Design a protein around this ligand. Structure first.
Ligand SMILES: Cc1cc2nc3c(=O)[nH]c(=O)nc-3n(C[C@H](O)[C@H](O)[C@H](O)COP(=O)(O)OP(=O)(O)OC[C@H]3O[C@@H](n4cnc5c(N)ncnc54)[C@H](O)[C@@H]3O)c2cc1C
Ligand SMILES: Cc1cc2nc3c(=O)[nH]c(=O)nc-3n(C[C@H](O)[C@H](O)[C@H](O)COP(=O)(O)O)c2cc1C
Ligand code: SF4
Ligand code: SF4
Ligand code: F3S
Lengths: 210, 456, 106, 105
């Protein structure tokens, strides 16, 4: 309902505590805490239409992004840094990569991740879900088992949620790389990994299996 | 299998209905949008009155090949694109159709086109290539009152209009009518002369005031490697002409007893543009069971305008078509001395939008026949050599001033496909049109007679 | 000199020009031969000799620009528009200034 | 601008202008001649889709812009967004020019 386009760089706490109705397009890039406490608002961050950068090979948002969020969407054509989605309690986000300590202590929301993830991913993540595009099958070396599992997508209701988010990501973000994964879904879906909290396995309306 | 007029646009006398429909608008957008700047309101008004001769005259004045253009012009891209009525339910007027009709009746009349009295008479002028560009240039020059000869490599005249554009779209008698009108002017055409070893610009310099280089883009694109027709492979350059020869009666004296090329089984046509779609349609003409049109790029960015793609679509040709990046043909596999299949890689567009080919994903498409549609280009070295000293751009094409269409050499001009800048019959005719005034200015200067500026 | 009192806040052409333009147009009709009156593109742009601000080309680029939403496309439209011969008095005015340029961000 | 200035009334009222302004410079020049607000119609019409075919009095608009007829109105593809863009550009184009002249506003 109120959308504010901004070229440039956002300083710390972009969109902090934004409720629904508010949309922030940042064309350029942003600092730490994008979406800190997101509360139903939507934040988007993508490079300039004139930047020669390859979306998914560069950083674009900082650290502690979406810390403690409870609602809203966040879309970012690029990598996030450290402790991304830490404590996310309910925001949905698509991002093209991310630092270490990802999705830590997450208790809700969904987190798609278009690329490499760093160490200790998912540690302490008791609930929400994360998909994670992994071209080299390395997710296994970076993840933190203790409370979560990962499997290839099997049920297709999940396979669908993924696809749709990624389409949203594109839409907003106008992201090639993502646009391309969709162009080749069939073979590409094959490469994500559904990351699902142990304690949510049995609570979950549509089982994740079969 | 057979070549009836597929054009949706073609109109019977019923054209009267649409003529009345035309708003006959002031400072009409359609004319502004026409390359030759035809006075569409007036010719259309004319047909509305029923005086076909008047419209025909109006059409011919601006373009010498009014007939062919009416049939062929990608109007949506052109004059009809800015037709005001498009706002209406009925939609835009089919200006191309009315142009064809008015033109056709004129053909029936059999009137000859007279010369205007006189001008700086004419040191020999030579034009190379019998296509739209040269014919237009030659006719305008003759209107000026010069003696001109067009040297054509092939036995047939008309350029692509004759050679490649299908009979179902472009009847041969049409091209013949226009060439004859030009001929009445006294333009002389001689058929087995080539700009190459036989003819060169320096040779012409031996007595020749000016030259226009009309030869177009004679050859086709590369990947097939030595592949033979017997095996399967045919370039658009090879394929279209053979169908043309069998299909169009006046084109060659010899009857292609060989008959239409026998195309059987699945046919793969590679190309986005006009060329690919025409080959797809012509293929069914020669008995193809199925035709697949493969595009490197995405469906959205098909090069040909919708009317022509429509013809292939109605035809039931399948378009495997996805991602801006190239379904790109890696290799053709031949077994049994016949092409069994073509190997492709999938391609997809990145944010950069630069095309990417993903080697991991491959497609093996079975095909008995492959026709490569990619396009044409100049590459024949003796031809290029013929051209010296004239400067070539880093597109390896003759450089010309956009306005004058003059080459580095003042005496030599160029127009049409060779310029690489437009790929339509009406732009090619326009090129010749514009050139003619400039060659005229140049020659008259030789005469030591001025030309105004306004040109007319 | 010749008409009642009327303002003419900018002298313009005079007898000499008038003379000239009159005569040119006269040639066109006698010092040559003529079939019909041209079309005209006064009351409406045809792709004639009477130009107009809004002619198809520019319109396209505009529409484009503002649909695809590229400032860049916008920027070629304005150029299409700014590079013609003068058609309007502002068109006769350059803009020089004596300060040195400042960064857009400011 | 002048007269009002000459009578010392020129600060009492704001001046606005319109007429074919299509462009950044068109706007700057207007300002320097003294205007403070600029009116933009046609061009904003065109962005909502006018194709300049002049049949506004006729009620046959190819594009849903100047027409009361229903069927025709359904051909309309105007967008708040499109217009918003139009202004957005003009503006930036203006700031571009100013910074050229060394002025920051
Ligand atoms: C398959 C296909 C379909 C098309 N469909 C359409 C359509 O629907 N509508 C449309 O508007 N346009 C269409 N076009 C494009 C149109 O045909 C060309 O733009 C137009 O014919 C170019 O005219 P031209 O005179 O430059 O050259 P052509 O290429 O038309 O003419 C060149 C002439 O030079 C001769 N020549 C070549 N080399 C030499 C030499 N060394 N010495 C002497 N003579 C030589 C050739 O034999 C030929 O007669 C199509 C093109 C192709 C290939
Ligand atoms: C279709 C149309 C309708 C208009 N209606 C009015 C009107 O109702 N009242 C009015 O005061 N001016 C009216 N105007 C004129 C504009 O309000 C403004 O003065 C001028 O239209 C801008 O024209 P421009 O885009 O060439 O700059 C109208 C103009 C157009 C094109
Ligand atoms: S005069 Fe031209 S084709 Fe006829 S209605 Fe279409 S724009 Fe006016
Ligand atoms: S020559 Fe001009 S562009 Fe082709 S008015 Fe006729 S079909 Fe249209
Ligand atoms: S095109 Fe614009 S011109 Fe008027 S008639 Fe339609 S609103």
């Amino acid at each position: 309902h109120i959308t504010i386009r901004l070229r440039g760089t956002a300083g710390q706490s972009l969109g902090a505590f934004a409720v629904q109705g508010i949309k922030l397009e940042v064309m350029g890039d942003a600092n730490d805490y994008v979406g800190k406490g997101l509360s139903g608002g939507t934040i988007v961050v993508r490079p300039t239409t004139s930047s020669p950068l390859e979306t998914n090979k560069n950083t674009i948002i900082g650290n502690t992004v979406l810390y403690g969020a409870t609602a809203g969407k966040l879309f970012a054509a690029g990598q996030a840094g450290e402790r991304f989605a830490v404590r996310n309690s309910g925001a949905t986000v698509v991002v093209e990569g991310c630092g270490s300590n990802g999705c830590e202590y997450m208790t809700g929301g969904t987190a798609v991740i278009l690329g490499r993830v760093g160490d200790n991913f998912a540690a302490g993540m008791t609930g929400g879900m994360a998909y994670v595009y992994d071209l080299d099958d390395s997710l296994p070396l970076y993840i933190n088992d203790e409370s979560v599992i990962f499997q290839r997508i099997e049920v297709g209701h999940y396979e669908s949620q993924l696809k749709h988010l990624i389409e949203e990501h594109v839409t907003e973000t106008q992201s090639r790389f993502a646009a391309e994964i969709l162009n080749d879904w069939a073979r590409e879906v094959t490469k994500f990994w559904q990351v699902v909290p142990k304690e949510m396995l049995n609570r979950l309306e549509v089982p994740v299996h079969l | 299998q057979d070549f009836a007029e597929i054009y949706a646009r073609f109109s019977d006398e019923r054209a009267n209905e649409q003529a009345n429909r035309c708003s006959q608008c002031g400072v009409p957008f359609c004319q502004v949008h026409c390359p030759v700047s035809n006075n569409i309101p007036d010719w259309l008004k004319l047909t509305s009155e029923g005086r076909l001769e008047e419209a025909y005259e109006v059409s011919q004045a601006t373009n010498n090949f009014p007939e062919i253009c009416g049939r062929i012009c990608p109007q949506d891209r052109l004059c009809e694109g800015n037709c005001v009525i498009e706002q209406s339910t009925h939609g835009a007027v089919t200006i191309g159709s009315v142009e064809k009709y008015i033109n056709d009746t004129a053909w029936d009349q059999g009137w000859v086109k007279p010369r205007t009295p006189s001008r700086e008479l004419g040191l020999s002028v030579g034009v190379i290539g019998a296509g739209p560009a040269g014919l237009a240039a030659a006719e305008e020059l003759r209107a000026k009152g010069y003696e001109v000869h067009v040297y054509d490599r092939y036995d047939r005249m008309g350029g692509l209009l004759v050679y490649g554009i299908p009979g179902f779209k472009l009847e041969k008698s049409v091209v013949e009518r226009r060439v004859k009108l030009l001929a009445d002017a006294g333009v002389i055409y001689h058929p087995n002369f080539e700009v190459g070893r036989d003819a060169s610009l320096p040779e012409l310099r031996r007595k020749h005031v000016a030259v226009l280089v009309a030869t177009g883009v004679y050859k086709a694109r590369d990947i097939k490697a030595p592949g033979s027709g017997l095996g399967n492979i045919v370039a658009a350059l090879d394929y279209l002409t053979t169908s043309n020869k069998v299909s169009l009666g006046d084109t060659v004296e010899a009857y292609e007893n060989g008959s239409l090329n026998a195309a059987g089984k699945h046919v793969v046509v590679l190309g986005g543009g006009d060329t690919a779609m025409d080959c797809v349609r012509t293929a069914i003409r020669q008995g193809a069971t199925s035709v697949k049109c493969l595009y490197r790029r995405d469906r959205k960015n098909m090069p040909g305008s919708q009317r022509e793609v429509a013809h292939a679509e109605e035809e039931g040709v399948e378009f495997i078509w996805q991602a801006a990046p190239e379904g790109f043909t890696g290799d053709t596999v031949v077994t049994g001395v016949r092409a069994v299949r073509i190997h492709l890689g999938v391609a997809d567009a990145t944010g950069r939008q630069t095309p990417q080919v993903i080697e991991g994903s491959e497609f093996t498409v079975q095909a008995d026949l492959v026709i490569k549609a990619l396009g044409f280009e100049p590459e024949d070295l003796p031809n290029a050599f013929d051209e010296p000293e004239l400067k070539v751009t880093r597109w390896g094409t003759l450089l010309v001033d956009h306005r004058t269409k003059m080459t580095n050499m003042d005496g030599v001009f160029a127009a049409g496909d060779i310029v690489r800048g437009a790929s339509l019959v009406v732009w090619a005719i326009r090129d010749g049109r514009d050139a003619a005034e400039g060659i005229h200015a140049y020659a008259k200067a030789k005469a030591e007679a001025p030309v105004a500026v306004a040109a007319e | 000199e010749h008409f009642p009192a009327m303002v003419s806040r900018i002298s313009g052409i005079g007898l000499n020009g008038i003379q000239k333009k009159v005569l040119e147009q006269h040639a066109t009709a006698y010092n040559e031969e003529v079939v019909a009156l041209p079309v005209g593109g006064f009351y409406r742009f045809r792709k004639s000799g009477d130009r107009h601000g809004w002619e198809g080309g520019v319109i396209h680029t505009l529409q484009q620009a503002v649909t695809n939403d590229s400032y860049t496309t916008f920027k070629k439209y304005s150029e299409q528009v700014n590079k013609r011969p003068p058609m309007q008095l502002r068109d006769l005015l350059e803009l020089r200034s004596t300060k040195a340029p400042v960064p857009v961000d400011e | 601008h002048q007269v009002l200035t000459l009578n010392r009334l020129r600060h009492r009222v704001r001046l606005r202008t319109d007429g074919g302004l299509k462009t950044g410079r068109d706007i700057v020049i207007a300002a320097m001649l003294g205007a403070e607000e600029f009116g933009i119609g046609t061009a904003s019409l065109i962005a909502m889709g006018c194709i300049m075919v002049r049949q506004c009095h006729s009620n046959t608009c190819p594009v849903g812009v100047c027409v009361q007829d229903d069927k025709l109105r359904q051909k309309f593809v105007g967008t708040p967004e499109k217009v918003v863009n139009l202004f957005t550009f003009l503006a930036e184009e203006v700031r571009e020019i100013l910074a050229g002249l060394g002025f920051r506003s």
